[PDB]
């Protein structure tokens, strides 16, 4: 699929809207200094690149996943939100478990939309 003419960006943007869940407490829908602005200087030396899931939803609508075959700039802008989660809250924290259940689902509903779409 060579001349693959891209995903329809609105509907890569309800698929990343889609992955703002109540049982993860909503704590990937922003961005992390957007919610503690304070934490800044200790998080971004942790943390140099970040993402959320507004940001993602912004960026699918300007068309930035729309031309990988299966998603991957997206599964990759996921993959940083779960990792940062874990990185700078702790791999025993409640936080680091609601990472990986949220990647899980996440790269789950992004291989379904891909089979879906094609
Ligand atoms: C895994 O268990 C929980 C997860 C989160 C909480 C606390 C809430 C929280 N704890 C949060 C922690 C982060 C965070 C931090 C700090 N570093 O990476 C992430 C991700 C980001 C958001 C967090 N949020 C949500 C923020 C307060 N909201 C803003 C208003 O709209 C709803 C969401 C409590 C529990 Cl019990």
Redesign the pocket.
Known sequence: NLYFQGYNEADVAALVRSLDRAE???????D?LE??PY?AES?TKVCPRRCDLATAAQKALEGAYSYDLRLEGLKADIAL?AS??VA??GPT???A???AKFERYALEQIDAFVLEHN
């Open positions: 993860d407490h909503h704590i990937f829908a922003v992390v919610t503690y934490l998080y939100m940062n989660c700078y809250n924290s409640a936080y478990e609601t990472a």
